[PDB]
Amino acid sequence: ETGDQCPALCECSEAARTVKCVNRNLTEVPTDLPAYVRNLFLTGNQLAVLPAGAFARRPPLAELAALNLSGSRLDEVRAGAFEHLPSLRQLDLSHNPLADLSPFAFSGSNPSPLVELILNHIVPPEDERQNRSFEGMVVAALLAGRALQGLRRLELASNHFLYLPRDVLAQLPSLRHLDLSNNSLVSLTYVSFRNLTHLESLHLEDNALKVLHNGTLAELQGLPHIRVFLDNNPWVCDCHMADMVTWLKETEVVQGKDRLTCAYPEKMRNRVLLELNSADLDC
Ligand SMILES: *[C@@H]1O[C@H](CO)[C@@H](O[C@@H]2O[C@H](CO)[C@@H](O)[C@H](O)[C@H]2NC(C)=O)[C@H](O)[C@H]1NC(C)=O
Ligand SMILES: *[C@@H]1O[C@H](CO)[C@@H](O)[C@H](O)[C@H]1NC(C)=O
Ligand SMILES: *[C@@H]1O[C@H](CO)[C@@H](O)[C@H](O)[C@H]1NC(C)=O
Ligand SMILES: *[C@@H]1O[C@H](CO)[C@@H](O)[C@H](O)[C@H]1NC(C)=O
Numbered sequence: 001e002t003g004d005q006c007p008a009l010c011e012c013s014e015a016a017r018t019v020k021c022v023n024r025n026l027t028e029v030p031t032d033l034p035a036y037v038r039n040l041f042l043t044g045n046q047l048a049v050l051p052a053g054a055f056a057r058r059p060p061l062a063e064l065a066a067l068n069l070s071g072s073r074l075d076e077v078r079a080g081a082f083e084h085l086p087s088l089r090q091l092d093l094s095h096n097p098l099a100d101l102s103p104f105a106f107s108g109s110n111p112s113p114l115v116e117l118i119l120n121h122i123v124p125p126e127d128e129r130q131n132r133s134f135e136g137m138v139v140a141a142l143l144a145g146r147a148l149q150g151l152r153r154l155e156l157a158s159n160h161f162l163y164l165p166r167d168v169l170a171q172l173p174s175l176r177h178l179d180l181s182n183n184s185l186v187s188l189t190y191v192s193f194r195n196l197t198h199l200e201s202l203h204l205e206d207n208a209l210k211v212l213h214n215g216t217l218a219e220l221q222g223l224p225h226i227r228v229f230l231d232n233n234p235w236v237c238d239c240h241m242a243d244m245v246t247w248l249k250e251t252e253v254v255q256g257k258d259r260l261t262c263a264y265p266e267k268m269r270n271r272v273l274l275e276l277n278s279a280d281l282d283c
């Protein structure tokens with residue numbers, strides 16, 4: 001509220017333990033952040049580079065638990081950017097053209113407190129100029145040091161990813177919720193969901209998936225506790241779709257299953273998958 005201790009260009013609430021420095025075209029993280037802060041919003045700025053120790057203060061921001069840097073024109077997050085935030089549970093870097101994400105951005109040097117990481121729409125425009133894998137860069141940051149052991153929720157929508165990163169599933173043992181919506185995934189064939197006991201939610205909407213084959217159906221058929229989201233994929237309703245349609249009619253795993261429709265072939269375009277039978281599915 002008015003009069004609460006606050007940096008210039010920010011609005012603060014001591015009662016809510018909240019600092020908001022939003023849509024202010026800031027170029028650097030404010031230096032005199034109040035030590036009470038639990039929730040810090042620094043969205044809509046022009047930060048460019050997040051250096052090591054960008055939030056490290058003396059005394060530290062020991063209560064800072066939620067940090068939102070979405071939409072702030074960050075193009076580089078350096079090694080150790082989030083060091084000396086011992087309570088940090090939720091971090092949002094979405095809608096930043098992150099051309100340079102250090103592998104040690106989340107792990108620092110030398111296990112992270114992070115429980116939720118939101119990295120939607122981080123792929124820079126015209127990233128193909130780079131001679132490095134963007135998805136690989138992000139994966140390396142996720143796995144470095146095995147620092148992200150407590151991570152329970154990961155969002156990686158809208159990043160032009162071409163494949164489901166298998167190492168993320170194998171090496172983040174606490175993950176409960178994974179969002180890979182609005183990417184360009186084409187199949188799940190070489191991905192194993194067999195031992196993913198903790199995974200409660202998997203978002204694959206708006207990808208380029210053609211069909212799920214029996215192998216994947218089998219492994220999902222054996223995860224009772226998952227919710228999978230498959231909306232707006234360009235399903236190909238030919239004879240290879242037969243297993244998936246059979247499964248879809250029986251399963252409780254797929255959320256919103258009534259919305260799934262064929263994109264191809266032409267004679268099946270826009271037909272609802274749950275309504276199809278063996279006679280519709282021919283090669
Ligand atoms: C981080 O800050 C952004 C910007 O305020 C929040 O963005 C909004 O998110 C909702 C869905 O959660 C959208 O429907 C709005 O359109 C978003 N606005 C913008 C400008 O992107 C975002 O929710 C915040 N995230 C958290 C976890 O605090
Ligand atoms: C931030 O920058 C943009 C373009 O430079 C401008 O339109 C906008 O008014 C600025 N924001 C504020 C709060 O002045
Ligand atoms: C979906 O992904 C595309 C391309 O990566 C992006 O341009 C578009 O903004 C994304 N959609 C949303 C709703 O963010
Ligand atoms: C789950 O299986 C994969 C691939 O077979 C393996 O790499 C991973 O370590 C297993 N997970 C656990 C927690 O042991």
Ligand SMILES: *[C@@H]1O[C@H](CO)[C@@H](O)[C@H](O)[C@H]1NC(C)=O
Nearest residue numbers: 213214215217218221243246
């Ligand atoms: C796939 O698995 C199901 C399980 O009921 C089975 O009935 C079906 O014939 C199998 N299809 C294959 C291997 O194409």
